[PDB]
Symmetry: C3
Subunit: 412 residues, 3 copies
């Protein structure tokens, strides 16, 4: 069987590369939703990650940059980040990995040629190509019923194809209730100005109608470093009186992405969000006091990772997932995954892509799978050295859990 690191390394890498991936959180959409689905070499280069980076070098003002056309911005970013300096950053490295995967050749640095490749395909075609290259079988979307464009599709009866699943984003409802309350009553949900039984019932109705319309795998929200629960606030009262009860009834997990400090640099748009360490008290309280509720959690601060792992050791109704945003870097992904496996075995979800542009699925999963594989190799090899015997079939099983089964199993 397997009784050599070399043999093991090969079996593991294969299992990992071949395993069909369920990306449980992304910003992609079923191609039939139209425009909202982004793909293009230009889309890749104008990803907010690179906008932030380009602004550290270029002399072009942020206003001017926003004034430029998508292609113009893409030309500037390519010049500033790939030509004037080596594309060593993770985000840049990712653009190259995408090109290479599609069959293009970074060696030539021919942006005009790369562009021609996309110009002759359709959304549906690129989707099949990318999902095939990245070996992604299922894509969970981020569906926000507060976005006018997005809401049209849903109200018109449009459904995503079997490859894409919905997830109900509630940020506007939980974090901006004072403004959102108006739009609710505007849509027929008679919430009053004061928080009473009437408002509670309507907000629950709102949630139920959308759960019914989207059939989401989970409801989610991104929270600031200062998040706490319980709390006398709109968010605290809504989570307690509406979200949790509804989620328990429909057995839908509540996904919390904690740690983002919104718009510390407004002019940068989506590139202007920062990070902060959060207290674990609110998450600990939710897990303990709501045993019949399920929670998916990922945190933005490097300093929250270890304790999050320990918290998962305490509560089975907590499923932690991915290396989110500023954590989505080789150095962090490696330390996070090792700490996670060492204390949780395989009872967690290693990664998600958070892709905003279709092609990212390629590098996102390529870059992470190689790291995850190395970790697996070390852990399998360690028990192997302890005289334990791992079969290739067990490896495929474990890998199946990490990249797909654990999620579906949890969302039950």
């Amino acid at each position: 069987s397997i009784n050599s690191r070399e043999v093991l390394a090969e079996k593991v890498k294969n299992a990992v590369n071949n395993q069909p991936v369920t990306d449980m959180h992304t910003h992609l959409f079923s191609p039939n939703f139209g425009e909202i689905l982004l793909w293009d070499i230009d889309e890749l280069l104008t990803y907010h990650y690179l906008v932030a980076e380009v602004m550290r070098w270029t002399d072009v003002s942020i206003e001017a940059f926003w004034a430029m056309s998508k292609r113009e911005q893409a030309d500037l970013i390519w010049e500033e980040l790939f030509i004037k300096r080596s594309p060593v950053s993770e985000a840049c490295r990712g653009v190259l990995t995408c090109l290479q995967g599609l069959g293009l050749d970074p060696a030539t640095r021919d942006l005009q040629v790369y562009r021609e490749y996309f110009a002759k395909k359709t959304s549906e075609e690129q989707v099949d190509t990318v999902l095939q290259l990245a070996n992604v079988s299922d894509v969970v979307m981020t569906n926000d019923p507060f976005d006018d464009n997005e809401r049209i599709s849903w109200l018109e009866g449009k459904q995503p194809d079997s490859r894409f699943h919905a997830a109900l984003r509630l940020d506007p409802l939980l974090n901006e209730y004072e403004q959102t309350k108006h739009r609710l009553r505007d849509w027929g949900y008679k919430v009053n100005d004061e928080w009473n039984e009437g408002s509670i019932q309507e907000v629950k109705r709102f949630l139920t109608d959308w759960i019914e319309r989207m059939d989401p795998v989970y409801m989610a929200v991104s929270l600031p470093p200062t998040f706490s629960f319980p709390e006398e606030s709109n968010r605290g009262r809504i989570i307690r009186d509406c979200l949790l009860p509804v989620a328990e009834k429909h057995n839908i997990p509540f996904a919390m992405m904690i740690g983002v400090k919104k718009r510390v640099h407004p002019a940068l748009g989506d590139a202007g969000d920062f990070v902060g360490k959060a207290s674990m008290d609110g998450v600990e309280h939710l897990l303990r006091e709501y045993p019949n509720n399920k929670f998916l959690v990922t945190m933005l601060s490097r300093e929250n990772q270890h304790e999050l792992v320990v918290l998962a050791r305490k509560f089975s109704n907590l499923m932690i997932f991915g290396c989110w945003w500023f954590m989505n870097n080789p150095e962090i992904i490696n330390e996070m995954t090792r700490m996670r496996m060492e204390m949780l075995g395989t009872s967690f979800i290693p990664q998600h892509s958070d892709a905003r542009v279709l092609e990212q699925l390629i590098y996102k999963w390529h870059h992470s799978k190689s790291i995850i594989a190395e970790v697996l190799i070390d852990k399998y090899d360690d028990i192997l050295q302890a005289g334990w015997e791992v079969t290739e079939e067990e490896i495929k099983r474990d890998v199946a859990d990490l990249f797909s089964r654990n999620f579906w199993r949890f969302v039950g």
Copy 2:
């Protein structure tokens, strides 16, 4: 001499493997204490570490689990964590390492056969076997005069054999004084309800009588993330008015294990403790204001490790030790030991086992020694490359300090 990494690597590993270990903190007992000393493949599998992990997978309710028999629980944990998924976690890896060390063969996964091995031995026999395999020469125990069972032995005149040393655990006195005060006066220590000269003298008497009865290498307590000193509280007043003065007089170190948040998940029993980052202010104050007192410290939060190292650079009356609990994982042990050696040389104690079940001493020390060795190899090799010459005898000396001499030297 040694002028090749390969040569060095061999000399170092040998020195490390051969060096007799003094485990300065465990939850083991001199076999003559009877039952309290745990050993068994079943004991290993039901270690709270694995209980936490199994609960993340199994459908068996926590109540049912506690309802099961030791063997039943052990069967469930083996099935859920070793058969249904690969035992890649550190705690699981450790069980295998123990089996292999005793001569059993994990390859067969024959739990019934492994069990037979233990069924035919006596406590005294297993002790000699394990201590020999783990190459542990001395074991410091955790002796709590507040536990009825444990207190019987001491009051009956029972003494541990020369291989086991006592350590006075004071958690109940320091963290639960309101409840403990009653038991004290119950034992003849006339402490009053209010904290006055009378109460102070009696608590000191209590400490002195037990110091005299146990001849402990140190007095110890585990503290929450919110620990602070000075503090107007029972703990603060007791440490100031009684513990520190008595410790100085008898020249006994005060061991503080900081960072545990007790019972965040009650149902899990010993598996329900969490972690939190602590402020260094209290430790800094103690070290500076009590120069004639010695302090042994270990912290639970990953985020406290680096600053703890720096604090050790400031005060020689501080001796830091081990990679405690949630820190006892390869990824953390490696980063901790490297930061420690880089800033403290060899003036610290790398590890302790915290073993609750006898056999753990095997993997606990096996897993850590390999990591510590790798660190040593890198550090010796670095000065070697700088034209310095290290003798095998110097290596044995350094290794002697790390695994035994530093502790005994500090406890003077």
Copy 3:
């Protein structure tokens, strides 16, 4: 071209070793300043880093140590840290690396011979030797107009040679204004007891006169973990009403070294400073509200590093630099540099020496360059594997930025 890791590794290491270094922060002085410039094997051994370490081992009281002569202290430290135990610590390793670089041989452990080497050279000669060995082209000093000795040189018209640049240290003005205000009015700066327009104008005049007299590359200050801004305090008012306006007018960057907790152990002198994690709020506020001001920042806490990197992604007027003090260790330098490059590409300054003794420049840069090189090799190799082609000339360019261009470019 370069299409093999081995080939790449060689090209990178060469580029790194050959690249002339601009050390943007040190405690060295142009030799013509005289005594203040420290150099010697004895100076190296009595560097506060080793004083802290020796005190963890030796029985010599701290008073006695301070009573000893420089040579006596150097003998004690050598015996205690190099002979009685292996010099595995980073600071010790550094002393050896220095010896070896100067051509001496650590293998003999002949302290008396090493000493003879220095006894026959002059300041000017050692400077040329060291700067040549360390391949350092430019050295930024720390110039404090509050130190009497240092202030004499400046008032006497003494200028440093083209290799040394001035940096205006303002700690006494910002952190000890209540005491410093007296010395100011003492020097003709008519600041009143209360903070009014008069005081503001005089403090600005003070800053302007010294900017004019030193022509500094930046103004700097070291701050405590509790640093915050805005703040109703002398520091907060001085930064707002004087420092920032003057800095904008003269386009001089403001360098903040955050995280030092001064004198937690007074007796240890310069060896008695501790560390603490800081809030990023003050830095975030400064960067956002003063877009026309430039900021150089380095932090002392390991727990501030990642977020500092993310903050740099948000603001181009923020330039982060080095692995400061307790961060200047292999384990930390590696994690810091990897996180930095992964999120910032090459838009940052990897390291500075902080040398207090001339020869340190040798090991300081030797130890860091090897680590930085390894990171570069991994990042170049990663894009190489993505089909990108890096030329040796591009590598030399990138390396030029990291070790010199980014700084000068930023200080404009």
